């Protein structure tokens, strides 16, 4: 499919940035997670980034560490996450769906088989958090064979060699985390997938700022999860607060 | 691009977030440079000799082999300053930290022995040391926590995940990814992302080099086999390395069998786990069927690393080294036997290596064999654990 290509073309028509929330699948439970995700979409999310709970998320800070713990407390497994992904896609045919994965969960039952299941359930991209471009070949190849975009992080300490590699290897979008203008213009020069800024995006002004700097949009890596954490005792207030937040963040992409 | 091969056959690699790759490349370059630098080697040699106490004895055990055709030597890393082999490679890594202009050390620890070694090296060499330790481990290792603190290190309990060694490993990597301009990550075993398996081997290889010289002096020939416990793989690869090209010499690594392999309550991923990708490397893992990382179980606290170094996985795959397991009860018996018959109190980790040598002897008592066991540490730290077990049984 071409879900990212179609989204960016549509956003470019409307002079609009993308806003992409992250949440952990199955946090704080499967049912509530499904409702959370439909609320994010209804409220204006342009795409989703979805985590699968993993025992040892060594690229994640405390907010997401705790989300994983909640999902494990609810007994959430990768198999259940894939059942969730199929249901999400069946409800929402055009929204790009990206996974944030740890390498062991991709490798566990075979790299090719993992990407084949992603294709079957309708996932569009996979970012493997602990696979640097240097180790990425079998992941990117399997992704592309199954019509999945492999997503790479361009970190704050990126050099030119890395920019060229990420530009060559990535698809869908570049996950942006040396001057910001430099990275963004260099990525465009090298024909990289459109850049989404993912560093500490927690307020509307940061969305506007990302677009102004020339990025195609912004990813909220943990702010959505923080709202879940804060509202655990009140499922209905949780949804209300998520709606208000996503609405505000999307409004800022204009 | 790296200077050195990050893999041992299919095992190893650099499976870290992209943000950490510059830290690994910097460390590899500093190591390669250090290995060609006579000044670095002389400073390392001086600390090993005059601070740590190398060379360590090779003790012939006078009583335990009586009535058999086994001759058994113990390489006495229990006599190194700090009471275990961990001290050797911390001194080398602390010097690499200084070579790179770092002023701070991060370390992970499970049983606390690597944490103590990191703390003592940091105190000697003027580095600010922080140690991550799973909260469950902190609770059960108050003596070591206190030593680390007496030596001026900050000990940070880790409450995420299982609150054990793996979780402490994650936290150390998280810290380093933000702090690597000023801090060095002093990884405690021959595992993790390249270049650590290589560095840790080269900074432990004096164990085997000395053993070779000592056994030649005393016996006029190489050993038939050298035997070492395997938690993450550092003391074993330190003993093995200099013998790898001596193809007649057996290399035997002993993983913890815990309550027995068939119970699943063990720590023997090399022979009984499944290859996965975690902690920066592709290696055999303790893991669930759906790929969640699990803990290693052993009576011994130090055989808790839930994977194994990739060079061991490689040496096994090609048949150069053989790996076996020893249960809690076998290790405990070997502990008691060495105390009573040789007057040496061995670490419970090391007791796993000794137990397998005793099995080699007892199973075939008329087989002529010259064995060396790496005695990776002393067992003072274990006497309460042993006491509690012997009382529970009713032996005391
Ligand atoms: C006296 C002794 N012998 C062997 C080992 C086993 O480690 P390798 O296989 O030699 O690397 C250890 C380990 N201890 C670690 C993990 O808890 C630590 O202290 O942090 C040890 O303390
Ligand atoms: Na004898
Ligand atoms: Na292990």
Distance between CA atoms of residues B123 and B160, nearest Å = 28
Among B27, B315, B16, smallest CA distance to B193 is for B16
B167 & B255 share domain: no
* B59 and B45 both lie in a single domain: no
From CA A237, how far away is CA A70, in angstroms rounded?
18
> Distance (Å, rounded) from C-alpha B114 to C-alpha B152?
15
B328-342 vs B348-363: helix crossing angle, rounded to 10: 90
- Identify any residues that bridge with A195 across adjacent strands, giving them in sequence order: A174
* Separation between Cα atoms, residue B46 and residue B44, nearest integer Å: 5
Which residue in A77, A100, A96, A92 sits closest to A30, CA to CA? A77
Q: For tokens 């996985």, what's the residue?
A: B313
Position of tokens 């084949």?
A116
Question: C-alpha angle B292/B157/A233, rounded to 5°?
Answer: 65
Cβ contact B180:A70 at 8 Å: no
| CB of B337 closer than 8 Å to CB of B64 | yes
Q: Which ligand is nearest to the CA of B113?
A: 1
Q: Which ligand has the nearest atom to the CA of B172?
A: 1
CA of B231 to the centre of ligand 1 (A): 6
* Block residue for tokens 């975009």: A149
Pick the residue whose CA is nearest to atom 5 on ligand 1.
B302
Across the A:B interface, residue pairs with CB atoms under 8 Å apart total 92
B176-197 exposure pattern, b = at least 16 Cβ within 10 A, e = fewer: bbebbeebbbbbbbbbbbbbbb
Ligand 1 atom nearest to CA at B236: 10
Of B354, B347, B345, nearest to B326 by C-alpha is B354
- In this structure, what token pair is assigned to residue A82? 């894939």
Give the phi and the psi of residue B372 in degrees, each rounded to 5.
-120, 130
Strand order in the sheet with B7-8: B7-8, B11-15, B280-285, B274-278
B155 within some domain: yes
- Distance, in Å, from the CA atom of B34 to the CA atom of A239, rounded to the nearest integer, reads 57
Q: What is the dihedral of CA B199, B201, B202, B206, to 10 degrees?
A: 150
Give the atom of ligand 1 at the shortest distance from the alpha carbon of B230.
Answer: 9
- State which of B153, B177, B204 marks the end of a domain: B204
* DSSP codes joined into one string, chain A: --HHHHHHHHHHHTT--EEEEEEETTSS-HHHHHHHHHHHHHTT-SSEEEEPP-S--TT--HHHHHHHHHHHHTT--HHHHHHHHHHHHHH-SSS-EEEEE-HHHHHTT-HHHHHHHHHHHT--EEEETT--GGG-HHHHHHHHHTT-EEE-EE-TT--HHHHHHHHHH--S-EEE---HHHHHHHHHHTTPSPEEE-SS--SHHHHHHHHHTT-SEEEESSHHHHHHHHTTT-HHHHHHHHHHHHHHHHHTT-
CB B144 within 8 A of CB B115: yes
Q: Which residues of B touch A105 (CB under 8 A)?
A: 290-291
Asked if B244 and B290 sit in the same domain, the reply is yes
Domain edge (last residue) among B173, B188, B204: B204
Asked, for residue B340, whether it belongs to a domain, the answer is: yes
Resolution of this deposited model, Å: 1.4
- Dump the DSSP string for A212-248: HTT-SEEEESSHHHHHHHHTTT-HHHHHHHHHHHHHH
B165 shares its domain with B251:
no
Does residue B271 fall inside a structural domain? yes
Domain membership of residue B3 (yes or no) is no
For residues B108 and B223, membership in a common domain is answered with: no
Residue B312 has which token pair? 């061991």
Q: Per the structure block, which two tokens stand in for B238?
A: 């330190």
Residue B1 falls inside a structural domain = no
Q: How far apart are CA B76 and CA B239, in angstroms?
A: 12
Q: Looking at residue B355, which CATH number applies to its domain? A: 3.40.50.1100
First to last CA, chain A: 27
Which residue of chain A has the CA closest to B280? A130
Ligand 1 centroid vs B279 CA: distance in angstroms? 17
Q: Which of B182, B204, B226 is the last residue of a domain?
A: B204
Give me the number of domains chain B comprises. 2
CA distances from B387 to A251, B41, B335 (A): 67, 43, 12
Please report, to the nearest 10 degrees, the dihedral formed by the alpha carbons of residues A71, A73, A78, A79 taken in order: -120
Contact B165, B140 (CB under 8 A): no
- How far is it, in rounded angstroms, from Cα B203 to Cα B86? 10
Q: Which residues of A are designated catalytic?
A: 49, 60
Q: Both B373 and B252 in a single domain?
A: yes
User: Which class for A141: exposed (0-12), middle (13-18), buried (19 or more C-beta within 10 A)?
Assistant: middle
Structure-determination technique: X-ray
Query: Residue A6 CB: number of other CB atoms within 10 A?
Result: 12
User: In terms of residue numbers, what domain contains B75?
Assistant: 53-85+205-390
Is B290 within a domain?
A: yes
Report the alpha-carbon distance of residue B47 to residue B3 in Å, rounded: 28
Q: Are A49 and B287 contacting, i.e. CB atoms less than 8 angstroms apart?
A: no
- Answer whether B14 sits within 8 Å of A103, measured CB to CB: no
Structural contact between residues B70 and B364, judged by C-beta atoms closer than 8 angstroms: no
Closest CA to A147 of A127, A126, A119, A111: A119
- Residues B69, B197, single domain; the answer is no
Strands A125-128 and A149-151: parallel
Residues of A with CB under 8 A from a CB of B: 54-59, 61-62, 65, 69, 77-79, 102-105, 107-109, 129-135, 152-158, 161-162, 177
B170, closest residue in chain A (CA to CA): A58
The first and second tokens of residue B210, run together, are 């000395």
How close is the nearest chain A Cα to the Cα of B172, in Å? 9
The answer to whether the CB of B87 falls within 8 A of the CB of B80 is yes
**B159: exposed, middle or buried (C-beta count within 10 Å: 0-12, 13-18, 19+)?**
middle
Half-sphere exposure in the Cβ direction for A83 (13 Å, CA): 9
Matching residue, tokens 């990884």: B187
Length of chain B: 396
Q: Which of B111, B147, B326 maximizes ligand 1 atoms within 8 Å of its Cβ, making it the mutation to test the pocket?
A: B111
Which of B87, B171, B235, B236 should be mutated for ligand 1, with most atoms under 8 A from CB?
B235
Q: Which two tokens stand for residue B202?
A: 């080269």
Q: Are residues B284 and B330 in the same domain?
A: yes
One domain for residues B103 and B138? yes
Q: Which chain B residues contact residue A157 at CB under 8 A? A: 19, 22
User: Considering Cα of B186, then B190, then B193, then B194, what sign does the dihedral take?
Assistant: positive
Nearest C-alpha in A relative to B277? A104
Q: Can you give chain B as a three-state secondary structure string?
A: CCCCCCEECCEEEEECCHHHHHHHHHHHHHHHHHHCCHHHHHHHHHHHHHHHCCCCCEEECCCCCCCCCEEEEEEEHHHCCCCECHHHHHHHHHHHHHHCCCCEEEEEECCCHHHHHHHHHHHHHCCEEEEEEEHHHHHHCHHHHHHHHHCCCEEEEECCCCCCHHHHHHHHHHHHHHHCCCEEECCCCCCCCCCHHHHHHHCCCHHHHHHHHHHHHHHCCCCCEEEEECCCCHHHHHHHHHHCCCCCCEEEEEEEEECEHHHCECCCHHHHCEEEEECEEEEEECECCCCCECCCCCCCHHHCCCCCCHHHHHHHHHCCCEEEEEEHHHHHHHHHHHHHHHCCCECHHHHHHHHHHHHHHHHCCCCCEEEEEEECEECHHHHHHHHHHHHHHCCC
Which is it for the CA torsion B107, B112, B117, B120, positive or negative?
A: positive
The protein residue whose alpha carbon is closest to atom 15 in ligand 1 is: B302
What residue spans define the domains of chain A? 1-254
Interhelix angle A223-230/A235-251, rounded to 10 degrees, is 160
Residue nearest to atom 21 of ligand 1 (CA): B302
C-alpha triplet B147, B149, B151: angle, nearest 5°: 70
Burial code (b: 16+ CB inside 10 Å, e: under 16) for A205-230 equals: ebbbbbbeeebbbbbbbbbbbbbbbe
Q: Which two tokens stand for residue B160?
A: 């995420």
CA distance B367 to B53: 35
Instruction: Quickly tell me which residue has 């490993």 as its tokens.
Output: B169
């Amino acid at each position: 499919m071409e879900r990212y290509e179609n989204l960016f073309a549509q956003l470019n028509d409307r002079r609009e940035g993308a806003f992409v929330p992250f949440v952990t699948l199955g946090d704080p439970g499967i049912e509530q997670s499904l409702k959370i995700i439909d609320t994010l979409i209804d409220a204006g999310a342009d795409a989703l980034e979805l985590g699968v709970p993993f025992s040892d998320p060594l690229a994640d800070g405390p907010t997401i560490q705790n989300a994983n713990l909640r999902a494990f407390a609810a007994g959430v497994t990768p198999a259940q996450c894939f059942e969730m992904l199929a249901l999400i896609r069946e409800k929402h045919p055009t929204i790009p769906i990206g996974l944030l994965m740890y390498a062991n969960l991709v490798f566990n039952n075979g790299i090719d088989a993992f990407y084949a299941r992603c294709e079957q359930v309708g996932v569009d991209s996979v970012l493997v958090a602990d696979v640097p471009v240097e180790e990425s070949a079998p992941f990117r190849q399997a992704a592309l064979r199954h019509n999945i975009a492999p997503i790479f992080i361009c970190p704050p300490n990126a050099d030119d060699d890395l920019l060229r590699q990420v530009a060559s290897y990535g698809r869908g979008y570049t996950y942006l985390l040396l001057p910001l203008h430099h990275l963004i213009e260099k990525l465009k020069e090298y024909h990289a997938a459109p850049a989404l800024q993912g560093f500490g995006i927690s307020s509307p002004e940061q969305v506007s700022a990302a677009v102004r700097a020339g990025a195609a949009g912004a990813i909220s890596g943990s702010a959505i999860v923080k709202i879940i954490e804060k509202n655990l005792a009140s499922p209905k207030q949780m949804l209300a607060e998520l709606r208000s937040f996503v609405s505000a963040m999307k409004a800022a992409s204009r | 691009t790296t200077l050195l091969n990050p893999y041992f056959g299919e095992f190893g690699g650099m499976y870290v977030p992209q943000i950490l790759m510059p830290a690994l490349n910097q460390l590899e370059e500093a190591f390669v440079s250090a290995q060609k630098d006579p000044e670095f080697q002389a400073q390392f040699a001086d600390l090993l000799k005059n601070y740590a106490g190398r060379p360590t004895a090779l003790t012939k055990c006078q009583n335990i082999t009586a009535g058999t055709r086994t001759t058994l030597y113990l390489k006495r890393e229990d006599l190194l300053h700090g009471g275990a082999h961990k001290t050797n490679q911390v001194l080398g890594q602390a010097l690499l930290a200084k070579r790179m202009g770092k002023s701070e050390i991060i370390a992970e620890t499970g049983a606390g022995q690597h944490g103590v070694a990191s703390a003592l090296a940091s105190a000697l060499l003027g580095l600010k040391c922080r140690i991550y330790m799973g909260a469950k481990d902190v609770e059960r290792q108050s003596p070591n926590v206190f030593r680390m603190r007496l030596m001026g290190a900050e000990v940070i309990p880790v409450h995420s995940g299982s609150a054990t060694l793996k979780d402490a490993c994650n936290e150390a990597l998280r810290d380093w990814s933000g702090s690597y301009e000023t801090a060095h990550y002093m990884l405690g075993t021959a595992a993790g992302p390249h270049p650590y398996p290589t560095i840790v081997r080269e900074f432990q290889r004096m164990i085997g080099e000395e053993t070779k010289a000592q056994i030649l002096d005393k016996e006029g020939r190489l050993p038939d086999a050298v035997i070492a416990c395997v938690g993450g793989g550092s003391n074993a690869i330190g003993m093995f390395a200099d013998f790898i090209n001596d193809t007649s010499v057996g290399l035997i690594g002993v993983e913890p069998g815990g309550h027995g392999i068939e119970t699943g309550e063990h720590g023997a991923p090399l022979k009984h786990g499944r290859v996965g990708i975690y902690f920066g490397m592709k290696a055999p893992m303790m893991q669930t069927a759906d790929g969640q990382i699990e803990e290693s179980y052993s009576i011994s606290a130090g055989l808790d690393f839930p994977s194994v170094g990739p060079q061991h996985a490689y040496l096994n795959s090609i048949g150069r080294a053989d790996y076996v397991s020893i249960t809690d009860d076998e290790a405990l018996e070997a502990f008691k036997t060495l105390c009573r018959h040789e007057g040496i109190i061995p670490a419970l980790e090391s007791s796993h290596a000794l137990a397998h040598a005793l099995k080699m002897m007892r199973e075939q008592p008329e087989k002529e064999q010259l064995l060396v066991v790496n005695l990776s540490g002393r067992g003072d730290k274990d006497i309460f654990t042993v006491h509690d077990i012997l009382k529970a049984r009713g032996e005391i």
